[PDB]
Nucleic acid binder design. Structure first.
Ligand SMILES: [Mg+2]
Ligand SMILES: [Mg+2]
Ligand SMILES: [Mg+2]
Length: 92
RNA sequence: GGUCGGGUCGAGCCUAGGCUCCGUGAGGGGGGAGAAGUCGUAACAAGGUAGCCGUAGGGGAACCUACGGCUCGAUCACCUCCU
């Protein structure tokens, strides 16, 4: 339900790299090696192909970022119906 | 005191060669942490082919095989040597 606020933007998980590292495709047509904060790492399980919010790192904000929130099925369905995001971004 | 001649000592400077230090450096090599990637299961019980040492060959990877050695090897039957 919460939306990106600032430099944050959506993203689609592509492949997990191990040791809490994911490979997320963002809305600006860039692939980023993203790091999962440990606070939500322990309680929220993330799997390839999900809509998430990613904030790029302050330095070298082109290939690194942090994942802050995961969108459930109802939230992504509501977003698709509202029209803030399209279907081809999710499906690739 | 000037000028010239002779003998000797000499900091510095130039060239060549030989050693050595500092900065960058394409490319390559292992080491150490991390643990929400991956393929197997080598070790500990007889760990499911006992494990390990030396040498040599082979294999995605732990590993496998041959010759000589050690017990830091389990179970059953028989034998030997003691207290
Ligand atoms: Mg084994
Ligand atoms: Mg074995
Ligand atoms: Mg062979």
């Amino acid at each position: 339900v919460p939306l990106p606020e600032g430099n944050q933007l959506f993203g689609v998980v592509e492949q997990a790299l191990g040791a809490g590292w994911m490979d997320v495709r963002c809305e600006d047509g860039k692939i980023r090696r993203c790091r999962i904060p440990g606070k939500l790492r322990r309680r929220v399980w993330i799997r390839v192909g999900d809509l998430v919010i990613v904030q790029p790192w302050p330095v070298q904000s082109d290939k690194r970022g942090d994942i802050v929130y995961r969108y459930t099925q109802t939230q992504v369905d509501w977003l698709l119906r509202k029209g803030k995001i399209t279907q081809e971004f999710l499906t690739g």
